[PDB]
Amino acid sequence: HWGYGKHNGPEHWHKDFPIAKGERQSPVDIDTHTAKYDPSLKPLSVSYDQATSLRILNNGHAFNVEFDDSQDKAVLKGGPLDGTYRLIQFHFHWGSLDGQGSEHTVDKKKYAAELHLVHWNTKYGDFGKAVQQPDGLAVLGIFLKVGSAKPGLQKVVDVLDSIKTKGKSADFTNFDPRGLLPESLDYWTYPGSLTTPPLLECVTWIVLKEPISVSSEQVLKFRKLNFNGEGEPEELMVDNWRPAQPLKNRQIKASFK
Ligand SMILES: On1ccc(C(F)(F)F)cc1=S
Numbered sequence: 001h002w003g004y005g006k007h008n009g010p011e012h013w014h015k016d017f018p019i020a021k022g023e024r025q026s027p028v029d030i031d032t033h034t035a036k037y038d039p040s041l042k043p044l045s046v047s048y049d050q051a052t053s054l055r056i057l058n059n060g061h062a063f064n065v066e067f068d069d070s071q072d073k074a075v076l077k078g079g080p081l082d083g084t085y086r087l088i089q090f091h092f093h094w095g096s097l098d099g100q101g102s103e104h105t106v107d108k109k110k111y112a113a114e115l116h117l118v119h120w121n122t123k124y125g126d127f128g129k130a131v132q133q134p135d136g137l138a139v140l141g142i143f144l145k146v147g148s149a150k151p152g153l154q155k156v157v158d159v160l161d162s163i164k165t166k167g168k169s170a171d172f173t174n175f176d177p178r179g180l181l182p183e184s185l186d187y188w189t190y191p192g193s194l195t196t197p198p199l200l201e202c203v204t205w206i207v208l209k210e211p212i213s214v215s216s217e218q219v220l221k222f223r224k225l226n227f228n229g230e231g232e233p234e235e236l237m238v239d240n241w242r243p244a245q246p247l248k249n250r251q252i253k254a255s256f257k
């Protein structure tokens with residue numbers, strides 16, 4: 001099945017998921033000089049005060065921190081969005097080395113990791129119906145660079161030992177995702193897709209300009225996770241990022257001058 005190795009990695013995905021070569025695939029390189037400022041964009045509204053985290057799962061490709069999305073509790077609205085999008089989970093993509101790991105790049109620069117906070121458009125009722133629509137998801141993408149530790153990330157890092165292999169989960173209540181945000185909500189936005197199979201073209205991407213800093217010890221602990229299941233040969237969970245895809249007929253808009 002699909003993965004990130006030589007024989008099942010991004011260059012193979014198109015055979016099972018032909019939309020891999022579609023018209024609005026993600027990630028992309030963000031050319032800062034050509035992303036035009038759009039004064040019609042609204043500020044982004046990130047309302048996470050009432051977020052209810054439930055569980056953390058190693059899914060064999062990344063780890064997901066899952067939220068109760070049965071009520072409007074943690075929502076994204078404003079910016080390029082029409083309507084209200086409800087947080088369902090966040091995850092990261094990261095590298096084997098600090099010099100790679102992010103999926104979006106900025107003038108070809110790769111960051112050490114990228115955080116994706118996934119939200120679905122509540123006009124569609126649930127996540128499953130939202131991923132059948134071209135405006136079904138909004139993903140807030142935040143870059144990670146290695147420097148100072150991010151204190152708000154340490155509860156995630158400290159639980160990873162309990163979910164080392166594919167299929168493991170752990171209780172993960174009362175985690176506050178506000179502690180993962182940078183100071184600025186300046187962003188770039190464009191229409192795209194999930195960056196993992198099934199690569200669905202549902203996503204309004206909102207990529208924050210300001211990275212957060214994590215420590216080398218924090219990211220090292222992400223790199224001790226395993227793609228394999230318990231009892232299988234160890235394959236470290238590293239380099240679970242898809243490279244930049246053709247921009248095609250899309251414009252990337254900036255929320256800031
Ligand atoms: O990487 N990744 C994996 C899953 C999902 C979704 F939307 F399906 F939840 C989004 C992304 S970016």
Ligand SMILES: [Zn+2]
Nearest residue numbers: 091093116195
């Ligand atoms: Zn992702």
